[PDB]
């Protein structure tokens, strides 16, 4: 046994810090979220299936407003997400105060990356064991992932949680940079289906989007999501046959 | 400076003068006075120009933040009281503006009149605010019906600032009227209105 | 394990916070507390049982008035709970100070999650070893559970405490989404009769509630308690012969 | 800019003149300048709308707080003493104000006067306070009896300020009376009040 | 077991805390102090036993004064008590400042217990290891036991100290909620005599009591302990024969 | 002292007086009152010399810092907001300079005035600021077309300022013109500017 | 043993700081960066190859403009980069704020070292395990390496990161001080190519420079990059026939 | 008090008055008013003598720290700008002095004048803040040339403070002038200077 | 053996600080630096060779100007040296600021001893790893040594680092109280050649000096260095013959 994860302040001899590689594991145990980028906006798709029917069907939430034009999804503890999302919302809005311009997807991501990294260096506080997805259209549609390390990675399409490894391989084949808005939402609805190994019913997924033309965040109503979900079911069922 | 307010049953209409005069000195020419807090909510300020813009941007940002937190749009009351609280905190700075914060929320239509020492009060009648205010109140209360369009409402607010103007050298033109009709947030803007007051001449 | 459980800062190679699971077993040390949500109001039923008879049971209570239409219950340390809920009282009152408008049940839940999160994050301090059940009606009835770290799950039938597992099984079967406020009151006493493993006497239980129509807090006095308990006893005895 | 207050024998009756004006803007004339602290407590202010409503908000929030935390209805003196302590904290900017806090508690009925910089002192059944104070004493004390009910008390307060109104020049039209008889918390407002005073003045 | 008792910030895997359990053993180690509540007052008795005669015959102070109608008595760490009661005294004065009304025993107990809980939160600060039995009459008589854990419990009759357990079993049989003022103090003297297993003299007890009819704490001289002491001594003798 | 800003079809032009005189004090005739904030953004100061320069240095450091950090150019709106916040917060160290920040940015061309008391208002296409303002408005509007060229604009800017300096006995003989034609950022500077008004005999 | 290695304050019997030594190895784990100085300017070549085709090939950026005339590469964690560079950006401008003059290539690199030196002496924190290469021309061309330790070593061509070992051996024979700007650029991509031991493509690498006839950071587009990468690829081929 | 400064064809020469009063005593009898800041760097000051004395000690020390730290002598631009920050701080203390900081540096020869509220400003010609500045500007421009020698510079500088001597009450005969040519840091001091104002005669 | 290098708040049973003795063995893990005092000046030589030939001659380059008459060389961590050196430079100008008195060689060394002793005593930070030779002519020639902890000792010739022991032994034979500037400069070059077991070349050391007659720092120029290499090397060849 190690003690190279007694604190965040002890490197391993191999030159790595183990404790943020275990905060990375905190995200995986939580449920999946997929962010899917096309050339006509971005889509953001997230688990809401959670637990049995004791829990409310439309339980709040994985799909958070950051702005009325930048949205985020999480995976990991929804404690570390909840206060972090409080911190995110303030951060975008401070940008709006002092610039009277909306935060760009890249710039909000950079500030979350610094914030995370603050906790990472001191031994007196632990960093969040949470990862975040930041989706927008500033005026170029963009998708990022901000790590629990407070590292920044640009993505064409990305996933986190339980279904992370299935969605990756799946998009390795099918995804293109010229998918339509309609195709890219649907494509990731198959992938989301595969992530929980079940058909998608519209009451266990919350899906929001940022369109390029509007540049306004809008949330897909249960039954407006229903025909997109329905077309996904054909491919998800097909693929669960194998 | 003068700001007027009235409650119609089709909407909330408030008005400003954007070319404010010291007495013969001006440094405006399109100087802002009407702030869009939301599609249903407005902040109309009378006073200093500068203190109002600084205060307006604080408020705009928190109005959005609050929408996002409760997942439920702010009431008109909630934004009025937020400004009252900010005004007292920053009374250790020299920020002096008297405000009218009005709009539409699910409880109805309402206006809150705020002074820079605090306070927000419900008026569902006539309200006006500034030092063209006394002249303005005279026109407005008499010619108020609460059963009035948002079409016949703009003509009266116009009339009020206009009368103040011809007996003040502190209020000038720039007359803007905002209407919040419960479908859109329309600002008529100086250009058209200067021509409605052209026809209240000859 | 046996070292990565000796602080609130460490993660394990499974990426669990064991200090936070342990604060949660603290919840399970405390007596059962039960919430039901129905569409005509929300119900809070607290255990108010005394273990010796030289105890005075007016302060063995769970139910704390918070706002004039938000009540809440507690399970965990008694100590942790009073300081936490006093924070919540202030927070609900503060919200009225700067907005002139009672606090929403959700916002209060987000604020009190976030209070517990700084205490989970900072290594120099332990978390609050408590979960709340936050029950109110703001315009539309609400039931939340907060976890010891600050995680938020919206419910529709729930419990925390010793009897939790069994109350979870009970509402799997019995709780329906069409129960009237009256009907669901009895059903929630049948859920409390089950977990305590005998029939109930009104002196060992306390009921508080928020209905939608009245949009007030009341507290159920032992005179006004009885017709409900009498119905409840009949069925509590039947489930003790299964 | 004047207040009166009297214990009935079955409630607390207080009255407040509506009009506060600062410059050419009338802040209150049609709107609230009397505030609800609690259900069975009222507070009347003689002085500015901004300072009064912002401070009242505080007293109100610690009034609901006291009740919730300790599961017992507050005494009059508690709230009173608490407002005094607050006025010590902010004393660097205008907060000077003439307050009556009264209403009902377990030990009976009471009203307490808070001095403008702090302190709280008591009044057995008749207080005033305000700028019309001298004039109000003559009226309230004359028509007082030890058998004085709520009905003729709401009338009695109206007469005291409206007689004051003539010796003042600051004070203008409109008045709010509040009756806290224990079974109702009614804010009479100008319309009812003027019609009651249509016999006691004409 | 290990590593769950060497700090205050750690819980056990069962939701127990072995550090805080040991502070309860701290209460159990010291001398007995009994509080007995009645409908005419509340009687607070603490053992003024001295383990030598060199020790002053009125040892300062087994019964402290907090306010004019509020007293409390100690068992466990006597060091700590000096500090702890200074806080309690200032808290009752603080409420007379800010509301002009004395503090209710219930809310006082909450405040003192909160100060304790604050010293549980911090990792470098250990909690007070002392229990105080706060007694007073605010409208009706009230008796509370405040624990080292920060939790309050209200009673009808109570004990703390090394005699705690014996006097729960004793008053369980014997206590009734219909004792007179005289009958109450005498039954409490019997309880003290049982615990120490010798007869009483006015030199190994300190008694004060609180009257409803005076709304004030008064402190009982050795002369006027003599009638009560003689009457009580008979029952004690019969109990130490069986 | 005075400053002007006008928007062309292909540029923005603003102007300063580059010598500043107050009483009969000359502190240098080669002093700076023109700040290059970024590539095709400039800042033109009216008010006192020394507070313009001190405040100015900071806005430049911000301008780079925001560009680097975002990976993209600051707008006029980005820095206009930025200056106004900086002016409001520092009222422990206030600054008595009246800005006009303008230039070409991604949104297009626009010029905002920032008051010495803070707050950022936008002017549509004409703006004058300072003592010379009242007359200056009318000087610019005389030939004004928004399809005026950069060449006819630079010429036009010079007459507005040229009216202000000769009228006052405490204005300077120095003038600076700033041209921003997107394919240039030209600083005309006193020698070149003199010969433009050498036609006007003074 | 070995160490004495779980503190940052401890120097071990070697006289090294193990903590610090583990963090130079955390640089290596991060992706290679190649720095090269000539007499016509300074070229910095940086790896922007991360991920398969899950991630976008443009991933910020990784060659950050720090100042007007100074740019830097990073090797080590991207998370570590964000925070060291945030501070670095601010420092570059800070010199201009208080002097209104160029920051020195020597001086920037020292105060980038200083921030982490703070985090090396102090006990409450770790240094970031990141090594930036600091390349610019204030008035002569210079290349430095900043080290996670905080060491500042002027190089003339070098590598750090994964390719550290590889490129030193390469540059023993190839690196000369009479090289051309063009020759240096090409030689630096061969070095990188060797690091990855693969064929280059100009789309997943970014080359920027500070010339001495400019004194400004510039960056060489991917449309421009193609011929330099292509003459590189022949030389990678010669090497990978040995 | 007045300062002058001029940049030569191969160095820089700056000068100050001597024979001034502060309180009721003479404040210059062998006092310094030109301080050597760095090796080939100087400061001439017009204002409060002892604040200017104290500020020299600080700036002097920070110049050496730049040199010792970075192995590179300071530029004039560096130093002045750092003065500007300090003056900004020292508004809460007496610290009003009008500063010219000149010398030779890597960019060539230059002088930056630092305002009483702070603000560095480039001048590559002549500069004089002061009270005698306008008169000085008179005399200065008359024999200033960009091929003015370092010993044709000392004539000029003496001439101006002699015309200002009669216009101020702080200036006598025999004054400080300094030449900074990069191969000299030579300070003439009063004695020489009497002999240079005896070439005019008076 | 020990475990008292684990702290720096401790003493060991022999009353020693082993932490300080391994900060001593960080100095010995750095390249040597040598000082010579003669009675005509004082001359400080320090290694300027580091790494491979791919690092500038002018990579550290240790003998920093601190003041006009004080230079100070280093051995140990090149990271901690920098901060100390900067602190040494600031302390000397503070003395100038507050006195207008150029700081004594002795009093500068003293102020450094006290500065490093704050970092020895405090346990939230570590002691430096660096030894400096503080050297100059205040009004007579002086050479001191400030230690890792900050112990002040006066020397007439010393060395610090890996070369240390050999060069001590050498002086014990050769060094004479009758020594002159020319001889001294030669002497230290010989001494540096025993450390490195190999010849010297001109630019692979830097030498700073303070003369009595100038009483001002001048750096030895490479060209001025050249005749001293040639004469020193005479003795070097002889002493590296085995």
UniProtKB/Swiss-Prot annotation, chains A, C, E, G, I:
Q: Where in the cell is it found?
A: Cytoplasm
Q: Which GO terms describe its molecular function?
A: threonine-type endopeptidase activity
| Family annotation (Pfam families) | Proteasome, Proteasome_A_N
Report keywords, A-Z. Cytoplasm, Proteasome
Q: Could you give a single Gene Ontology term from the biological process aspect?
A: proteasomal protein catabolic process
The record's InterPro entries line, in alphabetical order, gives: Ntn_hydrolases_N, Proteasome_alpha, Proteasome_alpha-type, Proteasome_asu_arc, Proteasome_asu_N, Proteasome_sua/b
Protein activity control: The formation of the proteasomal ATPase PAN-20S proteasome complex, via the docking of the C-termini of PAN into the intersubunit pockets in the alpha-rings, triggers opening of the gate for substrate entry. Interconversion between the open-gate and close-gate conformations leads to a dynamic regulation of the 20S proteasome proteolysis activity.
Task: Report the main location listed first in the record.
Answer: cytoplasm
* SUPFAM superfamilies in the record: N-terminal nucleophile aminohydrolases (Ntn hydrolases)
Q: Which GO terms describe its cellular component?
A: cytoplasm; proteasome core complex, alpha-subunit complex
Give the multimer and partner information.
The 20S proteasome core is composed of 14 alpha and 14 beta subunits that assemble into four stacked heptameric rings, resulting in a barrel-shaped structure. The two inner rings, each composed of seven catalytic beta subunits, are sandwiched by two outer rings, each composed of seven alpha subunits. The catalytic chamber with the active sites is on the inside of the barrel. Has probably a gated structure, the ends of the cylinder being occluded by the N-termini of the alpha-subunits. Is likely capped at one or both ends by the proteasome regulatory ATPase, PAN.
Membership in a protein family? Belongs to the peptidase T1A family.
Role: Component of the proteasome core, a large protease complex with broad specificity involved in protein degradation.
| Name of the protein in its database record | Proteasome subunit alpha
Curated annotation (Swiss-Prot), chains B, D, F, H:
* PROSITE patterns linked to this entry: PROTEASOME_BETA_1, PROTEASOME_BETA_2
Control of this protein's activity: The formation of the proteasomal ATPase PAN-20S proteasome complex, via the docking of the C-termini of PAN into the intersubunit pockets in the alpha-rings, triggers opening of the gate for substrate entry. Interconversion between the open-gate and close-gate conformations leads to a dynamic regulation of the 20S proteasome proteolysis activity.
> Catalytic residues per the record?
1 (nucleophile)
Give the protein family: Belongs to the peptidase T1B family.
* UniProt subcellular location: Cytoplasm
Q: What is its main location?
A: cytoplasm
Recorded catalytic reaction(s): these are: Cleavage of peptide bonds with very broad specificity
One Gene Ontology cellular component: proteasome core complex, beta-subunit complex
Enumerate the Gene3D superfamilies for this protein: Glutamine Phosphoribosylpyrophosphate, subunit 1, domain 1 (3.60.20.10)
> Per the UniProt record, which EC number(s) apply here?
3.4.25.1
Matching PANTHER family: ATP-DEPENDENT PROTEASE SUBUNIT HSLV, METALLOPROTEASE TLDD
Q: Provide the alphabetized UniProt keywords.
A: Autocatalytic cleavage, Cytoplasm, Hydrolase, Protease, Proteasome, Threonine protease, Zymogen
Name-wise, this protein is: Proteasome subunit beta
């Amino acid at each position: 046994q190690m003690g190279y994860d007694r604190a965040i302040t002890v490197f391993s001899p191999d030159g790595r810090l183990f404790q943020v590689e275990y905060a990375r594991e905190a995200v995986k145990r939580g449920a999946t979220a997929i962010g899917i980028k096309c050339k006509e906006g971005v889509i953001l798709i997230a688990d809401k299936r959670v637990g049995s029917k004791l829990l409310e069907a439309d339980t709040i939430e994985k799909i958070y407003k950051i702005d009325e034009h930048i949205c985020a999804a999480t995976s990991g503890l929804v404690a570390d997400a909840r206060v972090l999302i409080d911190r995110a919302r303030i951060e975008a809005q401070i940008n709006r105060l002092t610039y009277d311009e909306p935060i760009t997807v890249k710039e909000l991501a950079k500030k979350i990356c610094d914030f995370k990294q603050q906790y990472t260096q001191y031994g007196g506080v632990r960093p969040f064991g949470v990862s975040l997805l930041i989706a927008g259209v500033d005026e170029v549609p963009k998708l990022y992932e901000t790590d629990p390390s407070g590292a920044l990675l640009e993505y064409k399409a990305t996933a986190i949680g339980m279904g992370r490894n299935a969605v990756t391989e799946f998009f390795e084949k099918e995804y293109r940079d010229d998918l339509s808005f309609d195709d890219a939402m649907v494509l990731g609805l198959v992938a989301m289906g595969l992530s929980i190994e079940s058909e998608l019913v519209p009451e266990n997924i919350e899906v929001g989007y940022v369109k390029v033309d509007d540049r306004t965040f809008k949330e897909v109503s249960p039954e407006e999501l229903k025909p997109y979900v329905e077309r996904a079911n054909e491919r998800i069922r097909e693929l669960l046959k194998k | 400076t003068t700001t007027v307010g009235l409650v119609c049953k089709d909407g909330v209409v408030m008005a400003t003068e954007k070319r404010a005069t010291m007495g013969n000195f001006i440094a405006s020419k399109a100087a802002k006075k009407i702030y869009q807090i939301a599609d249903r909510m407005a902040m109309t300020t009378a006073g200093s120009v500068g203190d109002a813009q600084f205060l307006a941007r604080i408020i705009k940002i928190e109005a959005n933040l609050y929408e996002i937190r409760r997942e439920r749009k702010p009431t008109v009351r909630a934004i009025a009281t937020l400004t009252s609280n900010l005004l007292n905190s920053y009374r250790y700075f020299p920020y002096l503006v008297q405000l009218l914060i009005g709009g539409i929320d699910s409880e109805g239509k309402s206006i809150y009149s705020i002074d820079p020492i605090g306070g927000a009060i419900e008026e569902k009648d006539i309200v006006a605010t500034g030092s063209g205010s006394l002249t303005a109140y005279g026109v407005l209360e008499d010619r108020f019906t609460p059963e009035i369009g948002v079409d016949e409402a703009v003509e009266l607010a116009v009339r009020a600032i206009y009368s103040a103007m011809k007996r003040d050298s502190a209020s000038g033109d720039g007359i803007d009227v905002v209407k919040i009709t419960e479908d859109e947030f329309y600002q008529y803007s100086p250009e058209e209105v200067e021509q409605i007051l052209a026809k209240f001449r000859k």
